[PDB]
Amino acid sequence: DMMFHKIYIQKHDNVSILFADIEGFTSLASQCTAQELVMTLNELFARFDKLAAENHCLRIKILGDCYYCVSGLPEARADHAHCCVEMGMDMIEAISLVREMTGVNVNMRVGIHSGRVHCGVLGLRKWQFDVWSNDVTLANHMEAGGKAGRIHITKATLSYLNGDYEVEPGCGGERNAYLKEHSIETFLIL
Amino acid sequence: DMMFHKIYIQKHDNVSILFADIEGFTSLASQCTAQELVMTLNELFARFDKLAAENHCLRIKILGDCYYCVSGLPEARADHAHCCVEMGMDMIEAISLVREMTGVNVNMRVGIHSGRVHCGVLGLRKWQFDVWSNDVTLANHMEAGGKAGRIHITKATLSYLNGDYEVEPGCGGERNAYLKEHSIETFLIL
Amino acid sequence: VYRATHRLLLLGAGESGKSTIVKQMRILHVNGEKATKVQDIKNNLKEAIETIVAAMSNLVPPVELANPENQFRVDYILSVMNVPDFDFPPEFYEHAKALWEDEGVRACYERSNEYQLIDCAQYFLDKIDVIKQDDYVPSDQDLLRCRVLTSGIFETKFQVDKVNFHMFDVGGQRDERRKWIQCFNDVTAIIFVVASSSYNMVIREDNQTNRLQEALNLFKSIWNNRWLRTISVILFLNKQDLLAEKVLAGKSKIEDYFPEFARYTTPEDATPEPGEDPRVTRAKYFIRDEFLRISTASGDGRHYCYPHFTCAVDTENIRRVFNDCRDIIQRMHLRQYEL
Amino acid sequence: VYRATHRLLLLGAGESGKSTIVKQMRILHVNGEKATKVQDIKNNLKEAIETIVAAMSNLVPPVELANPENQFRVDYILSVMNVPDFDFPPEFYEHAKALWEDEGVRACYERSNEYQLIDCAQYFLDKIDVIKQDDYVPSDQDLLRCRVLTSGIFETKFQVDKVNFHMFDVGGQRDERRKWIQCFNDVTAIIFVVASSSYNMVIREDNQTNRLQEALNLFKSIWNNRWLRTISVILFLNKQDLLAEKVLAGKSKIEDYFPEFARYTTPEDATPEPGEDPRVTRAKYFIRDEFLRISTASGDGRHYCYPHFTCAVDTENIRRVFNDCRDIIQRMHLRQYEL
Amino acid sequence: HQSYDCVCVMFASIPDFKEFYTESDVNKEGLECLRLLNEIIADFDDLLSKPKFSGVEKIKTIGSTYMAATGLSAIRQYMHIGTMVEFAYALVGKLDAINKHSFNDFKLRVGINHGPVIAGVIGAQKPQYDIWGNTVNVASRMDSTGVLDKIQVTEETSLILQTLGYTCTCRGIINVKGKGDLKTYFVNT
Amino acid sequence: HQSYDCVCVMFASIPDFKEFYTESDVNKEGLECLRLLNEIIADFDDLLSKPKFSGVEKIKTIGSTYMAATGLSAIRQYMHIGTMVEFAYALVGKLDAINKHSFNDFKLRVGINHGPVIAGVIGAQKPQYDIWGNTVNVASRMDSTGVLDKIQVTEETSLILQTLGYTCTCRGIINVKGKGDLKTYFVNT
Ligand SMILES: C=C[C@@]1(C)CC(=O)[C@]2(O)[C@@]3(C)[C@@H](O)CCC(C)(C)[C@@H]3[C@H](O)[C@H](OC(=O)CCCCN3CCN(C)CC3)[C@@]2(C)O1
Ligand SMILES: C=C[C@@]1(C)CC(=O)[C@]2(O)[C@@]3(C)[C@@H](O)CCC(C)(C)[C@@H]3[C@H](O)[C@H](OC(=O)CCCCN3CCN(C)CC3)[C@@]2(C)O1
Ligand SMILES: Nc1nc2c(ncn2[C@@H]2O[C@H](COP(=O)(O)OP(=O)(O)OP(O)(O)=S)[C@@H](O)[C@H]2O)c(=O)[nH]1
Ligand SMILES: Nc1nc2c(ncn2[C@@H]2O[C@H](COP(=O)(O)OP(=O)(O)OP(O)(O)=S)[C@@H](O)[C@H]2O)c(=O)[nH]1
Ligand SMILES: [Mg+2]
Ligand SMILES: [Mg+2]
């Protein structure tokens, strides 16, 4: 308002954050033209944006081959955990379809976590809606310490799922140092 | 002899160079004690050294979790290609045995190439027998651009194998920049 | 709701006296725990004694014991200096006390500005026989003296005549100053704390930067801060007691650390205390005017500076001056409430 | 087998004349390709003309044309300067020649030490009408003049009275010197090449380091090299023709680039050529003695230095001095064969 | 969306920020932290309004990493590459101003690279402008493997910068995922 | 084989060597190249015979990377860590001498770290002494992510080096495979 520029950010609890990367994305970039790459990419992400609206996830950003969204925004929902899992399901099938077309071995790696966030925009120019917090950080590390073709979830994301989905030991502490060092019990959806 | 220190090195043609790394070695190191790690490692490598004598490969060095040897040394053999492949077979089974014991998902990644080398020792102190050349470099990149649980071989290594083994397209140009940039036709043994 | 509360931020250099002010607020306005703090008092006693003996040899010229016998007690003290969990056995107090009686040790204490020594030294050492008791219960003045370094930000709440206060305590040492920012927005007023007595001392952080100078420089940073343009400062010129003692002692002169004090003549509006030496008046006002030169040179009636001669260990002086401020804080939370 | 062969390494700064010596060895001792080298000769002609015109303006004081008309030919030359695959159309030769006739252009040519100009300039420009012919066949003297920079190491083999030679050619420019090492082991003798005439010139690499000085410094590096303790140097003081011309021209004095030349008086053992000016003698010997001071000051009868005044473009001078060496090379491959 | 031939991309990140980031009751669960980041990113956006930086196009911020490019408003030659560098220095100065007032010490870590890219919009929902290409990944790696208070540039980028009057020092070699090893330089001040 | 508590490990590599490496008929298919490497590694081994480096234990050479450790001949305290550093400087001086004579310009890239290791013999055939542990991997990464003519050290290693009288500058942060991100420093001369 007066001495600090007005901030367009607000706290939100009970949300679930999804992160996904493209497994073998670099080998795909090796095969095709610079242009054809941007179309496969641009097309796949156009598809993901649809699934987002269906599954009730608000898409945040696209950073290269890293896609992420969050259910529970803009307005609060109980299903927030189930939505992201569902989105995660769809994303994994969708990528396998474009895996046919290209004939290359690409796949999605998903990671989800639940907790609070701060959402909004930073700075003055080129506003892009974003989310920030330790929970968002954890979710990203969940994606990073994930497993190919699988939805990697946390402790917190299991207590909002009401055990509707069936999981198994996740062993995320051995694929990511942050998961190790923070004693995070991870699971994989069946 | 007089103005340059005497070199203990000599050229050798028609040899085949094998490189192997431990897939998921870091996740294994996450699970066990510092000591128990050195014993699993030390034990696995003691086993590899046996297979080497059997399969007629001369073991060169152990660099962390990276093991490498070469058939065709010390003295020249026709089977040099078949030996390394055979060694590669054994190594892949052996690692799966210690994968039981630990219960962790470790595996070997093999890479082989054939051509000439220079072998010997460098410097004055702590002599360790070694090999050097572009072919050795290529073989290492073959290991690096390899595929889990598989023996990754080259063009040159297929023309010495006399097609006794059955292969398939290797696609190494998309897993390693050196393989890409040098137009190397790679294959995978079935 | 949020506006009926006054959020106060205590800023100032390390050991200036900020944490003590919060303590006084608990004494004064806030409704079994005294047991825990005994450990920390014993620690101050230990740290004090060992710091003085260690210094004896390292000073130039070095300082000898008055009694050669005490050498063994010196060895004893030095030998248990870095001990992890120290027992505080009965011998410790005897050795410690004997040393404090030694005239040559006190000689080294008088030169303490030449090294780093905690403020509660003389106070605690003077009452070793009180503190060693195993049924010992810390007085309130003991809790005020107990020195523990602050790292982090600690909020205290209180109420005065149903008026609410949210006080924020922070670390004043350099590494800690980076956390201050997290209280700048929504602050009602600054209470900047200064160790008036430390004109003859350097900071711990480098053993070279003069403590009063560091305070001036830090004040300037806060005053001309880009996020504090609106915010007024309540300047506490703390440790007025120690200052006076140093002035009357006449050992180390102010003119030697701040040559400008040589030009200084005492102001007109000066309101000396009853029976206050004119030189003490002259000194404390000089120190105030060094900070007023900083605030005068900028701000443009956008924010203001209100000085107060203080002594944080004195609960009486604090009740008085804090009431002096309750006045202005109302008026300040009103200026920002409108503009 | 391996010992009945003499491995010679040609070392020296860039453009000193090393590649030319190898050429002379083909002329002299080695048994359709002249067609390809015409392209490169045409390139030297182009590079020469455009370098002189470009320099005219950039010199201080700048240089004007003698005929204002030629300005357009100057524009023409400058416009096709960086052209990729140049056609060498009939006009090019007319424009180029006209420029070379212009007296003010030759004025700029005389100051060429003040910029970077290839050696074969005047030679080629003087025979444009010969070179433009489409049935043109390069003489041998043309191939000797053709300037192409060497990058890498190139081996040449030959036989003289059934004696074998393996000659190694290398790049003499700084970036190239790092490859030399790969010939140090197993070398029979060094043939170090020097551009005697370049006392008034700086190297390309920085446009500041004096070419003769760079040669001295480079010689010192080779002479006192840790891997060349045994190896003797055959020092070719090349470009004796250009040197003499510069000495007689009397335009730029040696004493101005190497003040020590002022102290120099000509030696006793000096064996001047028939009808050689005493000043030319004095100069060339001075240049030799600068290199002899380096070799004299170390080596301890472990290796030796044999100087020769040379001219690489002159096939006759080269046959002579190379035979002078065939002698010593036998004797040198014998010292290392025993010790 | 179209393609370009010579766009200069820059990533400037603040490594020490994540450490500063904390969540507690005192700082409104990390909000007072983001408040500072806002003042920083906003202080950086102010630079875009300088006439000398009118060629600079802010692409986005990733966490606390600022991403911008020169030469999108295109079709003497390489003057936009030098501009990108002047901009990096500009950011450093702004960040130093923040330090003065926040009693902190954030250092900037920069990576710049130039080459062919593909600019355009992506996504179905809220279409947003992004650029793609090896040229951009490499710039990213120049940052991620860079040093504090240093601008790391590729060899070619280095070459050009020298024609413009800057000097560079070889950092050494770096392994790029998919492009193999490659030689880099730090710009000098 | 036994374990230790405070061993100082060092990797010194020559990034520019592989470029120098070539195979052609002229250089005996790369042999003249290895000949130079021999002169370098041997020139480095000569340093071990200096009384001041009698605590230094050469472990091996990996390609053209020299690996050595201080404090294996153990059971004032951290004086062996400073020794390892003096040794790195020693290598740089030897390498500069090589340059003088080879008309080259190799720069050394160094990484040092200290901590618990496990020393011993491995393999059935020709039993050879190697050391293992996180302490060693980290030292390796200090090299691989280091800068030319720079010694890169971990934070704790940094702390100790300062008690001994050296100053350090924060490089920034580095991601270690398996240990996450971590802060590093360059030693000053
Ligand atoms: C601002 C505070 C703090 C601490 C909290 C936070 O949520 C982040 O903004 C996220 C997590 C969060 O905004 C989600 C996007 C992204 C990009 C993941 C941010 C970065 O990792 C931030 O840190 C960084 O700027 C450094 C890491 C950025 C590298 N990312 C890693 C993930 N891949 C997939 C894309 C690039 C971040 C961690 O910083
Ligand atoms: C000496 C010349 C040259 C060019 C040729 C050569 O054969 C090498 O010595 C090999 C290939 C060769 O000796 C096999 C072992 C190893 C260690 C693979 C060497 C290094 O890669 C060398 O380069 C290096 O010193 C840098 C790379 C070293 C990193 N390696 C990569 C492979 N992992 C498995 C272990 C560590 C090398 C490539 O250098
Ligand atoms: N004599 C005297 N001692 C005082 C006075 N104010 C504070 N002290 C003493 O100074 C010591 C340090 O004060 P303290 O309150 O810890 O400073 P601080 O500013 O909180 O220190 P930090 O948290 O930034 S490191 C205390 O142990 C207390 O005895 C005073 O006015 N007079
Ligand atoms: N007038 C004259 N010109 C000479 C003489 N020796 C060589 N040149 C000329 O110098 C030019 C360059 O000589 P060149 O043989 O290319 O040197 P270089 O040492 O091989 O050069 P580099 O390969 O290290 S860059 C040639 O074009 C040739 O005309 C000589 O003695 N007299
Ligand atoms: Mg405090
Ligand atoms: Mg040549």
* Choice from C16, C45, C167 to test ligand 3 binding pocket (greatest atom count within 8 A of CB): C16
* Alpha-carbon gap, residue D264 to D258, rounded angstroms: 11
CB contact under 8 A, E32 and C182: yes
Q: Which chains touch C (3 or more CB pairs under 8 A)?
A: A, E
For residue D292, which amino acid is it? L
Chains E and B touch (3+ CB pairs under 8 A): yes
A62 within 8 A of E123, measured Cβ to Cβ: yes
Query: Is beta strand C153-160 parallel, antiparallel or unpaired with respect to B187-189?
Result: unpaired
What HEC string does chain E produce? CCECCCEEEEEEECCCHHHHCCCCCCCCCCHHHHHHHHHHHHHHHHHHHCHHHCCEEEEEEECCEEEEEECCCCCCCCHHHHHHHHHHHHHHHHHHHHHHHHCCCCCCEEEEEEECCEEEEECCCCCEEEEECHHHHHHHHHHHCCCCCEEEEEHHHHHHHHHCCCCEEEEEEEEECCCEEEEEEEECC
* Alpha-carbon gap, residue D221 to D225, rounded angstroms: 6
Q: Which two tokens stand for residue F70?
A: 């201080």
The residues, ordered by sequence, that sit 6+ positions from B19 with a Cβ below 8 Å of its Cβ are B66, B67, B68, B110, B111, B112, B139, B140, B142, B143, B144
Instruction: Give the burial string for D186-200 (b: 16+ CB within 10 Å, else e).
Output: ebbbbbbbbbbbbbb
Domain that holds residue F76: 1-189
Three-state secondary structure call for residue B21 = strand
Q: Return residues 14-53 of F near B (CB < 8 Å).
A: 23, 28-31, 34-35, 37-39, 41-42, 44-46, 48
Query: Max Cα separation, chain D?
Result: 71
State phi, psi for E110 to the nearest 5 degrees: -120, 145
CB contact under 8 A, B122 and F34: yes
Helix axes C240-249, C278-296, angle to 10 degrees: 130
Helix axes D36-58, D71-79, angle to 10 degrees: 120
The reply to whether A159 touches chain B by the CB within 8 Å rule is no
Catalytic residues of B: 21-22, 65
CATH of the domain at F17: 3.30.70.1230
* Alpha-carbon gap, residue C238 to C308, rounded angstroms: 8
Tally of domains in chain A: 1
Sole residue written with tokens 């990149």: B141
CA of F175 to the centre of ligand 1 (A): 14
Q: Return residues 76-105 of A near B (CB < 8 Å).
A: 104
Nearest Cβ partner of E101 from C155, C168, C227? Answer: C227
Query: Is beta strand E109-115 parallel, antiparallel or unpaired with respect to E150-154?
Result: parallel
Q: Which chains touch B (3 or more CB pairs under 8 A)?
A: A, D, E, F
Q: Which of A120, A44, A48, A117 minimizes the C-alpha distance to A84?
A: A48
| Chain A contact set for F138 (CB, 8 A) | none
The residues, ordered by sequence, that sit 6+ positions from C336 with a Cβ below 8 Å of its Cβ are C188, C230
Atom of ligand 1 nearest to the CA of A136: 7
Q: How many CB atoms lie within 10 A of CB A43?
A: 13
B2 within 8 A of D230, measured Cβ to Cβ: yes
* Alpha-carbon gap, residue F132 to B160, rounded angstroms: 37
CB contact under 8 A, D227 and B2: no
For chain F, give the residues followed by a break (C–N over 2.5 Å).
Answer: 75
- Output DSSP code: residue F52: G
A98 within 8 A of A106, measured Cβ to Cβ: yes
Strand partners, F60: F67
| Chain C contact set for E24 (CB, 8 A) | 153
What HEC string does chain C produce? CCCCEEEEEEEECCCCCHHHHHHHHHHHHCCCCCCHHHHHHHHHHHHHHHHHHHHHHHCCCCCCCCCHHHHHHHHHHHHCCCCCCCCCCHHHHHHHHHHHHCHHHHHHHCCHHHCCCCCCHHHHHCCHHHHCCCCCCCCHHHHHHCCCCCCCEEEEEEEECCEEEEEEEECCCHHHHHHHHHHCCCCCEEEEEEECCHHHCECCCCCCCEHHHHHHHHHHHHHCCCCCCCCCEEEEEECHHHHHHHHHHCCCCHHHCCHHHHCCCCCCCCCCCCCCCHHHHHHHHHHHHHHHHHHHCCCCCCCCEEEEECCCCCHHHHHHHHHHHHHHHHHHHHHHHHC
* Alpha-carbon gap, residue E87 to E50, rounded angstroms: 10
Q: Which of B184, B136, B189, B135 minimizes the C-alpha distance to B163?
A: B189
* Alpha-carbon gap, residue D193 to D15, rounded angstroms: 9
Element (H, E) at B19: strand B8-23
**Rounded alpha-carbon distances, angstroms, from residue A110 to A107, A129, B131:** 10, 21, 43
Element (H, E) at B68: strand B66-71
Sole residue written with tokens 């055990």: A163
**Rounded alpha-carbon distances, angstroms, from residue C329 to C322, D23, D58, D283:** 10, 97, 75, 95
* Alpha-carbon gap, residue B14 to B114, rounded angstroms: 7
Task: Classify residue D89 by burial, with Cβ atoms within 10 Å: 0-12, 13-18, 19+.
Answer: exposed
* Alpha-carbon gap, residue D48 to D147, rounded angstroms: 11
Q: Which two tokens stand for residue F3?
A: 């374990």
Q: Give chain A as a DSSP string.
A: --SSPPPEEEEEEEEEEEEEEEETHHHHHHHS-HHHHHHHHHHHHHHHHHHHHHHTEEEEEEETTEEEEEETBSS--STHHHHHHHHHHHHHHHHHHHHHHH-S--EEEEEEEEEEEEEEE-SSSS---EEESHHHHHHHHHHHT--TTSEEE-STTTTTTTT-S-EEE--GGGT-HHHHHTT---EEE-
* Alpha-carbon gap, residue D284 to D238, rounded angstroms: 10
Residues with CB under 6 A from ligand 2: B 21, 63, 66, 130-133, 136-137, 140; F 18, 21, 62-65
Q: Give F109-161 as a DSSP string.
A: EEEEEEE--EEEEE-SSS-EEEEESHHHHHHHHHHHT--TTEEEEEHHHHHHH
Query: Is beta strand B151-153 parallel, antiparallel or unpaired with respect to B187-189?
Result: antiparallel
Residue D211: left (phi > 0), alpha (psi -120 to 50), or beta? alpha
State phi, psi for C196 to the nearest 5 degrees: -55, -35
Element (H, E) at B152: strand B151-153
E21 within 8 A of E104, measured Cβ to Cβ: no
* Alpha-carbon gap, residue E179 to B116, rounded angstroms: 27
Q: Is the dihedral of CA A25, A29, A34, A40 positive or negative?
A: negative
Which of C10, C157, C168, C179 to probe by mutation at the E interface, max E CB count within 10 Å? C179
* Alpha-carbon gap, residue F67 to B125, rounded angstroms: 12
Element (H, E) at F180: strand F180-187
The residues, ordered by sequence, that sit 6+ positions from B146 with a Cβ below 8 Å of its Cβ are B21, B109, B110, B111, B152, B172, B175
Q: Which two tokens stand for residue F81?
A: 């860590």
The residues, ordered by sequence, that sit 6+ positions from F98 with a Cβ below 8 Å of its Cβ are F36, F39, F40, F43, F104, F106
For chain B, give the residues followed by a break (C–N over 2.5 Å).
Answer: none
| Chain E contact set for B140 (CB, 8 A) | none
Domain that holds residue A34: 1-190
The reply to whether E179 touches chain B by the CB within 8 Å rule is yes
Chain E nearest-CA residue for A25: E178
Query: Max Cα separation, chain E?
Result: 55
Alpha-helical segments (H) within chain B: 25-31, 34-55, 80-102, 134-144, 177-181
Nearest Cβ partner of E124 from A5, A49, A118? Answer: A49
CB contact under 8 A, F32 and D177: no
The residues, ordered by sequence, that sit 6+ positions from E38 with a Cβ below 8 Å of its Cβ are A4, A5, A7, A9, A122, A123
Q: Identify whether F177 is a catalytic site residue.
A: yes
Q: Which of A128, A140, A11, A12 minimizes the C-alpha distance to A67?
A: A140
F95 within 8 A of F39, measured Cβ to Cβ: no
Q: Which two tokens stand for residue C100?
A: 């404090």
Q: Which of B111, B50, B119 minimizes the C-alpha distance to B85?
A: B111
Ligand number nearest CA of C195 is 3
| C161 annotated to bind ligand | no
Domains in chain D, please, with CATH? 1-34+150-336 (3.40.50.300), 35-149 (1.10.400.10)
Q: Which of E48, E80, E71 minimizes the C-alpha distance to E61?
A: E48
F94 within 8 A of F109, measured Cβ to Cβ: no
Altogether, the residues listed in chain C come to a count of 339
* Alpha-carbon gap, residue F149 to F157, rounded angstroms: 18
Task: Give the CA count within 13 Å in the CB-facing half-sphere of C292.
Answer: 11
The residues, ordered by sequence, that sit 6+ positions from B1 with a Cβ below 8 Å of its Cβ are none
Q: Which of D222, D236, D217 minimizes the C-alpha distance to D183?
A: D222
Q: Which two tokens stand for residue D123?
A: 């030679």
Q: Identify whether C20 is a catalytic site residue.
A: yes
Instruction: Give the burial string for F127-154 (b: 16+ CB within 10 Å, else e).
Output: ebebbbbbbbbbbbbbbbbbbbbbbbbb
* Choice from D9, D11, D19, D21 to test ligand 4 binding pocket (greatest atom count within 8 A of CB): D19
- Output DSSP code: residue B73: B
What HEC string does F70-115 produce? ECCCCCCCCHHHHHHHHHHHHHHHHHHHHHHHHCCCCCCEEEEEEE
A121 within 8 A of E128, measured Cβ to Cβ: no
Q: Which of C282, C304, C302 minimizes the C-alpha distance to C294?
A: C304
Tally of domains in chain E: 1
* Alpha-carbon gap, residue A75 to A72, rounded angstroms: 6
Q: Which of D147, D211, D282, D288 is catalytic?
A: D147
Binding site of A for Mg(2+), by residue number, is 21-22, 65
For residue F87, which amino acid is it? F
For residue D163, which amino acid is it? V
* Alpha-carbon gap, residue C78 to C99, rounded angstroms: 12
What HEC string does chain D produce? CCCCEEEEEEEECCCCCHHHHHHHHHHHHCCCCCCHHHHHHHHHHHHHHHHHHHHHHHCCCCCCCCCHHHHHHHHHHHHCCCCCCCCCCHHHHHHHHHHHHCHHHHHHHCCHHHCCCCCCHHHHHCCHHHHCCCCCCCCHHHHHHCCCCCCCEEEEEEEECCEEEEEEEECCCHHHHHHHHHHCCCCCEEEEEEECCHHHCECCCCCCCEHHHHHHHHHHHHHCCCCCCCCCEEEEEECHHHHHHHHHHCCCCHHHCCHHHHCCCCCCCCCCCCCCCHHHHHHHHHHHHHHHHHHHCCCCCCCCEEEEECCCCCHHHHHHHHHHHHHHHHHHHHHHHHC
CATH of the domain at A34: 3.30.70.1230
- Output DSSP code: residue B7: P
